[PDB]
C-alpha cells in the first residue's frame, strides 16, 4: 500500500489558543475526514491510509494530536483533558472553515473521535474508531474504581515525571519496543505496576518488528525529541476531569453515522470491550481485523483502507 | 464585507523543489479554487473574496506566489520565468492530491493562470483573470519590441538586478501608501517611470492613507516585504524574453475550458482595451467588468469581484 514521505506532504497549522497550534498534514479533495492518532504516536501512523483515502475521493487531514510533533505541547497537565482537547478541535474547524468532518481515530484518538461525536454531533458527518470502544461512564463508578486490571499500567502513567524518563532513557528502544504484531510483543501491560516499568523486563537492544523499518522507527524518533513524552503521557492524567465530563453528557445517544473497528489481537481495547456500544448508537456499523493488534493501521494497513473506504462511501459521501 | 486576521487562518506549506516551498492560507470545504495575487502583494490581497468564496461553498487557496511572503524567494532570476511557475503550481496540486483547481488570478497571477490554463488545462478546472488579459505571444514581435513599441517603458526600469529594489526597499511604508490607491486618488505616473529614473521621485516624502486601506493592512504587506524584500517579486519581469520564446510554444491553441476576463475601468497599465480579441484564442470566455475600479481590483471593489466571481464559480466551474 502506498505510504508517505513527509518532506512531499502539504504541512498545515492552526493556532487554536494562545501558545497552541495544531499541526496536520493534508492530501486529496472531497468529504473531509480527520485522523486522530493515538498514544504514543503521530499522524506518520496514518502513511498507508492517507494515499488511499485521497484516492478513494476524500480531503484527508491527518493530525498531530496536541503534545504529539510539530502540534503545540503546553506544560500543563489539564490541558491534555478530553473538553480542552474536544473544543480545540471544534476551533480547528471553525479556522479552516469545515461546517463538519467525518472524524476517525485510534487508541487515545478513538477517544476524543467518540467524544466530538457525543457533545458536537452537529461538527461530525460521521465517527469510526480503530480499537477504541465508547463505553459511556458510570457516575457511581470512579476511574480509579475501573483500574479492569489490563490498565494498572495507567496508574505507572500518573506521577508526572516517572514514565517519562522510562520513555525518553533510549528512544529508538521505547518505539522499536512497541510498535510489534502481538506475537512479537516484548512487554506486559499487565505487569507494568508490579515490576515498576514498561521496559524493565525487555530486551536492551530489541529488534525491528515486521510491520516497520528502521527508517520510520527513525521518523518518530525524531519527532519525540521535539516535546518528549510528558504531553503525550498527560492524556492518562485527566481521568476525573473526563469522568466529570462524560457523566454530563450521561444517557445521550450517537444518532450520527458511526463505526467501530476491532482488532482480534489487542489485548488492552480488546474486541469485547465494544460489545454493547448499539443500545448507545443506534447507527453503528462494525468492522473487525483478525491477526490484528494495537497499532491497527501499519500491522494490517489494506484491511484498515478496505473496511473505511466502503464505510466512507456508504455512510459518508 | 468580512476581511480575514491572519493569526486565525490554516497556513499551508508546500516543498515543490529542494529550496523552495509554497505558503498559502485555506479556507472552507468544496471545489479547490487556488487564487494568485500580482505584483508586488500578497495572499493577504485576497482579504475580503477568501471568507466570501468559503462562504460560497469554496475550498479557497490563497497563495504567496514565489518570492512572497511566506513562500521561498530562490535567487535565481530565472526561477520566477512563467515555465518554472506554472510547473512548480502544477506540483503543488500533486503535493496536495488534487487533479484541478480553479485558478483565479490578478495583475503577474493572472498571466499565471491563463498559461497554467493554456499549458496544463486538464489541472485547470476553469480559470479568471482579474485585469489581465491573455494575449497570444506574437512570434514576429519580440518583447523589447512590444515594451517601447509604451505605458510598459517602467518595465525597463526594473530589469537592472539591484535598482528598483533600492527605491522600493527604501521606505515600505511609503512604497504601499504609494501604490494601493483608488485611480482617483493616483500619486504615480507608470508611463513617466524609465524618463524620470524612479517610480517615487515625483511622489509625496509622507503620503497618505488611500480609502481603500487602514494603517494595519498596510503594516502587514511592510511586515512581509521585510523578509525578501522585491528582487524575487521583480525577477517576474526579468524573463520576457524566456516567457515569450516559451509561449510562442504553443502558438496558435486555444483555451477550451471555462474561462472569466474581468476589466478595471480605471486600470490605466491593464486597460479593459487590451482584452479585446481574447474570444478568439478562447471560445467559452465569460466576462466581468466593474466601473470606478483601478488596478488594485480586490480591495478597490471587494463586493463586485465577490459577486462576479460566485456568479461565474456558481454557473461554470461547480
Ligand atoms: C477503554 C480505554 C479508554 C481510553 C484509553 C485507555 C488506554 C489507552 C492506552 O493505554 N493506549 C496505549 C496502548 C494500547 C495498547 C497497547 O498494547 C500493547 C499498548 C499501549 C501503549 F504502549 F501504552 F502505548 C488508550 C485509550 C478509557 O479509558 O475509557
Ligand atoms: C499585459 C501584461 C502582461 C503581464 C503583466 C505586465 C505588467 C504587470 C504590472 O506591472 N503590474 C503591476 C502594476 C500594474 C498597474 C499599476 O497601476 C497603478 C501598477 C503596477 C505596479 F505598481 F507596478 F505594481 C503585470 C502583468 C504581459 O506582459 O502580457
Request: hydrophobic share 40%; with cysteine.
Amino acid at each position: 500500500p502506498t505510504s508517505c514521505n513527509p518532506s512531499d506532504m502539504s504541512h498545515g497549522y492552526v493556532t487554536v489558543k494562545p501558545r497552541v497550534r495544531l499541526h496536520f498534514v493534508e492530501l486529496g479533495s472531497g468529504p473531509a475526514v480527520c485522523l486522530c492518532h493515538g498514544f504514543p504516536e503521530s499522524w506518520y501512523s496514518w502513511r498507508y491510509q492517507i494515499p488511499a483515502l485521497a484516492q478513494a475521493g476524500y480531503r484527508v487531514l491527518a493530525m498531530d494530536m496536541k503534545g504529539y510533533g510539530e502540534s503545540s505541547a503546553p506544560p500543563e497537565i489539564e490541558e491534555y483533558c478530553m473538553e480542552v482537547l474536544c473544543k480545540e478541535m471544534v476551533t480547528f474547524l471553525d479556522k479552516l472553515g469545515l461546517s463538519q468532518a467525518v472524524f476517525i481515530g485510534h487508541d487515545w484518538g478513538g477517544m476524543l473521535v467518540w467524544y466530538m461525536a457525543l457533545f458536537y454531533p452537529e461538527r461530525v458527518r460521521a465517527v469510526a474508531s480503530l480499537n477504541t470502544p465508547f463505553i459511556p461512564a458510570n457516575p457511581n463508578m470512579s476511574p480509579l474504581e475501573s483500574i479492569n486490571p489490563v490498565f494498572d499500567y495507567q496508574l505507572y502513567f500518573q506521577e508526572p515525571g516517572v514514565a517519562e524518563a522510562e520513555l525518553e532513557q533510549n528512544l529508538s528502544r521505547t518505539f522499536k519496543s512497541l510498535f510489534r504484531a502481538s506475537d512479537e510483543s516484548v512487554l506486559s501491560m499487565h505487569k507494568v505496576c508490579e515490576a515498576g516499568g514498561l521496559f524493565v523486563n525487555s530486551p536492551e537492544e530489541p529488534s525491528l518488528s515486521r510491520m516497520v523499518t528502521e527508517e520510520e522507527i527513525q521518523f518518530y524518533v525524531q519527532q519525540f525529541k521535539k516535546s518528549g513524552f510528558r504531553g503525550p503521557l498527560n492524556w492518562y492524567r485527566n481521568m476525573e476531569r473526563n469522568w466529570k465530563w462524560a457523566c454530563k453528557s450521561l444517557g445521550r445517544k450517537i444518532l450520527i453515522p458511526a463505526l467501530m473497528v476491532t482488532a482480534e489481537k489487542d489485548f488492552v481495547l480488546v474486541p469485547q470491550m465494544s460489545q454493547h456500544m448499539e443500545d448507545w448508537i443506534p447507527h453503528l456499523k462494525r468492522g473487525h481485523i483478525e491477526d490484528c493488534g494495537h497499532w491497527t493501521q501499519m500491522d494490517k494497513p489494506t484491511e484498515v483502507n478496505q473496511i473505511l473506504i466502503k464505510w466512507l462511501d456508504s455512510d459518508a459521501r
